[PDB]
């Protein structure tokens, strides 16, 4: 049996996680859901609680904590440990019953639980790319300290890459380690992208797109922040750095390819030039499940891929002029040091501003660019604790700086 | 230090084998070509001997044995063991300084060397699908005895599938072994096809197609026999059975897909519905190479795949009315027993008849079908000496039956 905790369970990733767990459990009793953890969504959390009956429930916010104890009372013969805040999260991460944790918390906030889960030697099914981007070499140092802890990528492209690998090679090393790509004989990564909703617009249309146009479409079924990031292709930008860190592939060996059918989720080119790819309908259940079953696979009753019915698959290069966030991400990755933290932090603010119609499309890249130009490289701390503090302060600094730049230009 | 013998060195597979070995050795001096074996192409073999200086040369047609011996004296610093016939082949198969044997010998004939290589516990990089189709159950039995013998598929769709598998599991089993697909979590196989030259033709056009049509318009440079089989899609029919035997996959779990671009060379659907595919330009060098380096990869200077330039990939289901050879293969496969041997044997005749302009395109399938319809199930010999003999008997019966069906009509 596999004991699983779901962090951010009422969000997009967490809901998908619960679905695929539920559907698989109907075939064989594979998973136990031992913990749920959300931020405010007490009601939605309670409904999941009703059905899954986890031993642990937790809400980050204290203000909604009382309400949650009361709702839960309604459920008969169920008496769960009801916790709150960072404290509850640490209690969960350190339970001896929980084996694997799904981190579906959004933004830089997700780093906090990702680190405690590693410190506690857990398998971490990590959806939250903001954490790898902003805290890559820290998480690297944390994995070397806690040798049994593992990060298994849930981000669809990174799961796709991971599936295409020989696990006998993978087991010799692990995600986020130095030399991962050499052990696995990886030569190059094709990073697939939907292209987002703005893929066909001219530069002059781009100047005037609003947040509503970015959120509009039914094909983009995720949280509001990653939706916006898909529209600017900053999401792919962030996934380029995530690839660098998860697999230790050089930036010049990562190629972004727009594939609007979203069947081929990414491809790995090996040193012999043979390329391997993972394909399925655009669905996050596959990558979630794999991270929980890896290095094995289990039966699902998901719709099989009908290749004849999909019929056509297209590939083209993205326009760097229409999507300059991409180039910014490459520049920040290549620069190294804390430039990825700076990139991610300033994006968080520039993203939110566009979402709230406070800035225009091309301002996003304008803002992120000026913050990266302002940053001064710091020597990287040797001890984990000071590196952690260093990242927090640099992330906080960049948000502050983006807020200055924004305010100076409006 | 990989010591490789090349059987069929002068044909299309054998040539591509030497090409990839040549280019790979310019990077890393891995490969020793220890032996070369051909039928009659002595000047072509002499030109190859000179380049690769093998410890053994073997010519099958003994009438040209003196010619070979006398061309070879023109080579400096060279003193090879020069052998001929079956006995020459047997000697090579038993030599300890030979680890891997590439079988690029066409037709049923290739089963002899395949069997002897297995009996000497070699790794057999097998291009000759005819031996798997005629003698699948026997090869299986044989590999169960010579436990260190391995068959690694060289056929590109099968190498593709082989590559898509997770080697952490492949190493725990081997091709042609019970439970291969259970162990590897294989749900189904998408077996890809170029579709041949006749893929757009109506039925009335198909009636009239000739061998000149099939040979000028081919999708890859190959031997005449597979070229013709590609035109009728009997090749794919054969490959459906080769898949069944190599990978222990149920017939109703193998789906033929026409992919005219031939970038995707085949796809494996795993029990979770996730699909993994192998991709490269149309080439045989990689499938060959991988058969020779598995479980490892090595560097090549092959041109890397450029998905963006490729731009479009298409798929569709083949039509069984236009390509009845496919349907006959499933039927032979599903019936089991010696039906696949009959299918292969009668195809060898019909293919050749059409090649030589004696019969029409629908006569190929029509002749094969009658011979299949005529064959009567036999009890399967439980020992290897005998099963081999039984296979030879039926094979030559089916060949003679096909020829009789032709003679009684033209
Ligand atoms: N959604 C997708 O298809 C994909 C998502 N990702 C990544 O996965 C992550 C999650 O994205 P997504 O699911 O879209 O986002 P959502 O906004 O839909 O979900 C975020 C979840 O995190 C919870 N949460 C936020 N802060 C905290 C906290 N402080 N403590 C505990 N829980 C918290 C939210 O709780 P509450 O409901 O109470 O507010 C919610 O359940 C992102 O980092 C994203 O980049 C990556 C690839 C695909
Ligand atoms: N070519 C391709 O891309 C593919 C080929 N295959 C398979 O590979 C096999 C070979 O095909 P291909 O190379 O196209 O065929 P070719 O006709 O080009 O070559 C056959 C080779 O085998 C040699 N040969 C034939 N009979 C004997 C024998 N009695 N003893 C020793 N050598 C012999 C020939 O020698 P000689 O030159 O002296 O006549 C020749 O070198 C076939 O079974 C085919 O199905 C499978 C997938 C792809
Ligand atoms: C259909 C679909 C799949 C993937 C995405 C990507 C965004 C979401 C994501 O990162 N996933 C699913 O991993 P994008 O960055 O390629 O636009 C969008 C839409
Ligand atoms: C480009 C190309 C790929 C595959 C083929 C097949 C025939 C040869 C073959 O089996 N190969 C290359 O594995 P087909 O049966 O699909 O037509 C021809 C041309
Ligand atoms: Ca593999
Ligand atoms: Ca009968
Ligand atoms: Mg993604
Ligand atoms: Mg083939």
UniProtKB/Swiss-Prot annotation, chains A, B:
Inhibited by fosmidomycin and its derivative FT900098. GO terms for molecular function: 1-deoxy-D-xylulose-5-phosphate reductoisomerase activity; manganese ion binding; NADPH binding. It catalyses: 2-C-methyl-D-erythritol 4-phosphate + NADP(+) = 1-deoxy-D-xylulose 5-phosphate + NADPH + H(+). NADP(+) binds at residues 10-13, 39-41, 130, 223. Its EC number is 1.1.1.267. Binds 1 divalent cation per subunit. Mg(2+) or Mn(2+). This is 1-deoxy-D-xylulose 5-phosphate reductoisomerase, apicoplastic. The chain holds residues 77 to 486 of 488 of the full protein.
């Amino acid at each position: 049996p596999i004991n699983v905790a779901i962090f951010g369970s009422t969000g997009s990733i967490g809901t998908n996680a619960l679905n695929i767990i539920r559907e698989c459990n109907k075939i064989e009793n594979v998973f136990n859901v031992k913990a749920l953890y959300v931020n405010k969504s007490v009601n939605e959390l309670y409904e999941q609680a009703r059905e899954f009956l986890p031993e642990y429930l937790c809400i980050h916010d204290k203000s909604v904590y009382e309400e949650l104890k009361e709702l839960v009372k309604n459920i008969k013969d169920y008496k769960p440990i009801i916790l709150c805040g960072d404290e509850g999260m640490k209690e969960i991460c350190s339970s001896n019953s929980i084996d694997k944790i799904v981190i579906g918390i959004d933004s830089f906030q997700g780093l906090y639980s990702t680190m405690y889960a590693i410190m506690n030697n857990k398998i971490v099914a990590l959806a939250n790319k903001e954490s790898i981007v902003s805290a890559g070499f820290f998480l690297k140092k944390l994995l070397n300290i806690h040798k049994n802890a593992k990060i298994i990528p849930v981000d669809s492209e990174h799961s796709a890459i991971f599936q295409c690998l020989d696990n006998n090679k993978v087991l010799k090393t692990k995600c986020l380690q130095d030399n991962f790509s050499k052990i696995n004989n990886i030569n190059k990564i094709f990073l697939c992208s939907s292209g987002g909703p703005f893929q066909n617009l001219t530069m002059d249309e781009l100047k005037n797109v609003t947040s509503e146009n970015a959120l509009k479409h039914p094909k983009w079924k995720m949280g509001k922040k990653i939706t916006i990031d898909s529209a600017t292709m900053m999401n792919k930008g962030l996934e380029v750095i995530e690839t660098h860190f998860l697999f230790d592939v050089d930036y010049n060996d990562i190629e972004v390819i727009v594939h609007k059918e979203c069947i081929i989720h990414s491809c790995v080119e090996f040193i012999d030039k043979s390329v391997i790819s993972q394909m399925y309908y655009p669905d996050m259940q596959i990558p979630i499940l794999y991270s929980l079953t890896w290095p094995d696979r289990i039966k699902t009753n998901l719709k099989p891929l009908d290749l004849a019915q999909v019929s056509t698959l297209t590939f083209h290069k993205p326009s760097l002029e229409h999507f300059p966030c991409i180039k910014l991400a490459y520049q920040a990755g290549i620069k190294g040091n804390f430039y990825p933290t700076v990139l991610n932090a300033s994006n968080e603010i520039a993203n939110n501003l566009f979402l709230n119609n406070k800035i225009k499309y091309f301002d996003i890249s304008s803002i992120i660019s000026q913050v990266l130009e302002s940053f001064n490289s710091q020597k990287v701390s040797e001890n984990s604790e000071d590196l952690m503090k260093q990242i927090l302060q640099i992330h906080s600094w960049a948000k502050d700086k983006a807020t200055d730049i924004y305010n100076k230009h409006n």
